[PDB]
UniProtKB/Swiss-Prot annotation, chain A:
Family per record: Belongs to the RNA polymerase beta' chain family.
Taxonomy, superkingdom: Eukaryota
Function: Catalytic core component of RNA polymerase II (Pol II), a DNA-dependent RNA polymerase which synthesizes mRNA precursors and many functional non-coding RNAs using the four ribonucleoside triphosphates as substrates. Pol II-mediated transcription cycle proceeds through transcription initiation, transcription elongation and transcription termination stages.
Reported modifications of this chain: The tandem heptapeptide repeats in the C-terminal domain (CTD) can be highly phosphorylated. The phosphorylation activates Pol II. Phosphorylation occurs mainly at residues 'Ser-2' and 'Ser-5' of the heptapeptide repeat and is mediated, at least, by CDK7 and CDK9. POLR2A associated with DNA is specifically phosphorylated at 'Ser-5' of the CTD by CDK7, promoting transcription initiation by triggering dissociation from DNA. Phosphorylated at 'Ser-2', Ser-5' and 'Ser-7' of the CTD by CDK9 (P-TEFb complex), promoting transcription elongation. Among tandem heptapeptide repeats of the C-terminal domain (CTD) some do not match the Y-S-P-T-S-P-S consensus, the seventh serine residue 'Ser-7' being replaced by a lysine. 'Lys-7' in these non-consensus heptapeptide repeats can be alternatively acetylated, methylated and dimethylated. EP300 is one of the enzyme able to acetylate 'Lys-7'. Acetylation at 'Lys-7' of non-consensus heptapeptide repeats is associated with 'Ser-2' phosphorylation and active transcription. Regulates initiation or early elongation steps of transcription specially for inducible genes.
Protein name: DNA-directed RNA polymerase II subunit RPB1
The protein's assembly and partners: Component of the RNA polymerase II (Pol II) core complex consisting of 12 subunits: a ten-subunit catalytic core composed of POLR2A/RPB1, POLR2B/RPB2, POLR2C/RPB3, POLR2I/RPB9, POLR2J/RPB11, POLR2E/RPABC1, POLR2F/RPABC2, POLR2H/RPABC3, POLR2K/RPABC4 and POLR2L/RPABC5 and a mobile stalk composed of two subunits POLR2D/RPB4 and POLR2G/RPB7, protruding from the core and functioning primarily in transcription initiation. Part of Pol II(G) complex, in which Pol II core associates with an additional subunit POLR2M; unlike conventional Pol II, Pol II(G) functions as a transcriptional repressor.
Annotated compartments: Nucleus; Cytoplasm; Chromosome
Domain comment as written in the entry: The C-terminal domain (CTD) serves as a platform for assembly of factors that regulate transcription initiation, elongation, termination and mRNA processing.
Swiss-Prot record, chain C:
Chain segments annotated as transmembrane: none
Domain of life (superkingdom): Eukaryota
Location in or out of the cell: Nucleus
The name this protein goes by in its record: DNA-directed RNA polymerase II subunit RPB2
Family membership: Belongs to the RNA polymerase beta chain family.
Amino acid sequence: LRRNEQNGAAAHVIAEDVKLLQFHVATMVDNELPGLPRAMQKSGRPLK
Amino acid sequence: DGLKYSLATGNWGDQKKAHQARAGVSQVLNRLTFASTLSHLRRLNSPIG
Amino acid sequence: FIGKIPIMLRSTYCLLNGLTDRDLCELNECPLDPGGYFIINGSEKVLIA
RNA sequence: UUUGGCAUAGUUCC
DNA sequence: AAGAACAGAAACAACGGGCGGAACTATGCCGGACGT
DNA sequence: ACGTCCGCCCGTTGTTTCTGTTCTT
């Protein structure tokens, strides 16, 4: 996101990346929100 | 690999979707006594929680 | 050739189907063994109804 | 004299 | 004798967290494809 | 010979609804 905001984006890549970073941080805090992608890493096991 | 995995682990389904796969099929045979072996080979199961 | 299918012991497509007790003893198999289980990676698996 | 974890199954005792 | 805007209280619907205590064995698994 | 991409209970909060007050005509 730093690189995109430095080199200039297409006004929607920035928004999608912001949403993705928000999802990653939220799932790091709690990985049980209702109606979420439910991030996994490997073998299909959800994180902790 | 699919047949071997489903029989080896007991999670009846694909490996990627072992979340809703019903576990508890394909147990490892009991060999403590002959009666244990027979009563294991003739066994039922109700999927109720 | 599309893959390998595990075979249940003593079933029609096993090597012990129809053999006499003397042949079973020759193969170091117990004549009293009931059969009806799979051999997956060495261990013996039993499907539960 | 050095330290694996996740899951599933079975069993013992109230 | 009539009409409007606002406000206080309530019926029903949707959502979320909660669900025993110990202990002992065993078995499978921890990502996949590609060639410059 | 390495390195890149892909099953039941019940506390909250919302939504919607139904009347009361006061001002004006």
